[PDB]
Amino acid sequence: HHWGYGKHNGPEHWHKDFPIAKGERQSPVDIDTHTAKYDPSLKPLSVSYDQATSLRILNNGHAFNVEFDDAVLKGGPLDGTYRLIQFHFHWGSLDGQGSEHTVDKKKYAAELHLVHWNTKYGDFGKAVQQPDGLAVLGIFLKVGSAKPGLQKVVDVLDSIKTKGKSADFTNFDPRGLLPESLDYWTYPGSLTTPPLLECVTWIVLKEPISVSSEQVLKFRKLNFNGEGEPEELMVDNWRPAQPLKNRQIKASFK
Ligand SMILES: COc1cccc(CN2CCc3cc(OS(N)(=O)=O)c(OC)cc3C2)c1
Ligand SMILES: [Zn+2]
Ligand SMILES: [Zn+2]
Numbered sequence: 001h002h003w004g005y006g007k008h009n010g011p012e013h014w015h016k017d018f019p020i021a022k023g024e025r026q027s028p029v030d031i032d033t034h035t036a037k038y039d040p041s042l043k044p045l046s047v048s049y050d051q052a053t054s055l056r057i058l059n060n061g062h063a064f065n066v067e068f069d070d071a072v073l074k075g076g077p078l079d080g081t082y083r084l085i086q087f088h089f090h091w092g093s094l095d096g097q098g099s100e101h102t103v104d105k106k107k108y109a110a111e112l113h114l115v116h117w118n119t120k121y122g123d124f125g126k127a128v129q130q131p132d133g134l135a136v137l138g139i140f141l142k143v144g145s146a147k148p149g150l151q152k153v154v155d156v157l158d159s160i161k162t163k164g165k166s167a168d169f170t171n172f173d174p175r176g177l178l179p180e181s182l183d184y185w186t187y188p189g190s191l192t193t194p195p196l197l198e199c200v201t202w203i204v205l206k207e208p209i210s211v212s213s214e215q216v217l218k219f220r221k222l223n224f225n226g227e228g229e230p231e232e233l234m235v236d237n238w239r240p241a242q243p244l245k246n247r248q249i250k251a252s253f254k
Contacts, residue, residue: 004062004193006232011239018196025198027189027243028100028138032247034165038183039250045182046075047137047175052084055171057156061163061224062193063088063237066153066172070124071118074204075137077186077250082116082135085124087174089113090192091219091229093235095143100192100238101204103140108208109216110141111238131188131254133199137194144210149176153252154218163226179207192239206253 015021052071071084092098098107127133222234
């Protein structure tokens with residue numbers, strides 16, 4: 001019985017193996033624009049991805065991720081430097097849902113997560129045990145014009161349809177996944193999948209990227225299951241918004 005997104009192993013069940021699921025700084029959250037506070041101490045985000053070295057893409061039975069040779073994220077709300085280790089997405093069974101964070105309860109079609117670990121901890125495994133161990137950059141996807149920087153990703157999905165499948169994915173530039181503006185919201189939170197560790201500074205961009213219906217449809221062709229098994233379509237791999245508790249969401253923009 002391995003965690004998943006289904007009726008019998010989904011987000012409502014996770015707390016039984018991972019009690020921190022009911023913790024004080026869980027993610028994602030709804031971003032309420034009536035209450036999110038502008039904060040002048042917040043610097044512009046520094047995204048330095050020109051030296052990013054992608055390695056492979058893998059269907060892990062939950063999502064797909066692109067792994068990097070650990071590119072740096074710094075500035076913004078962060079002290080010191082964070083290394084890019086991987087990215088992945090969460091998405092829906094229809095365009096009207098799929099994101100993890102929401103904005104005034106609005107769900108986007110998907111959400112991109114660029115995962116970075118704090119270099120002061122030496123490696124990812126040590127970083128996740130610290131409250132400031134990770135910085136995840138979250139970017140909403142809406143349906144509109146195609147995002148050319150995403151094309152390499154969606155085109156490769158046919159070759160990694162089922163759990164365990166991987167493909168070479170060298171020379172992918174994550175800079176092609178960013179919107180124009182780096183205006184952001186930020187709050188202290190957690191990983192949104194088991195083990196749900198409370199080790200993340202969340203940085204969620206205000207501006208969504210536009211992807212085409214054709215592109216996002218390709219996400220929905222992936223399988224949760226392995227080859228030669230009952231077909232379980234990979235859709236709705238998102239955790240709902242969690243209690244904000246005693247936290248404050250700050251905005252970098254007025
Ligand atoms: C330990 O080195 C790794 C290198 C590449 C991929 C991984 C797997 N892991 C990294 C961090 C992470 C973190 C995640 O939490 S999230 N949604 O970004 O808050 C996650 O949920 C979908 C998945 C993963 C995948 C580990
Ligand atoms: Zn798994
Ligand atoms: Zn994620």
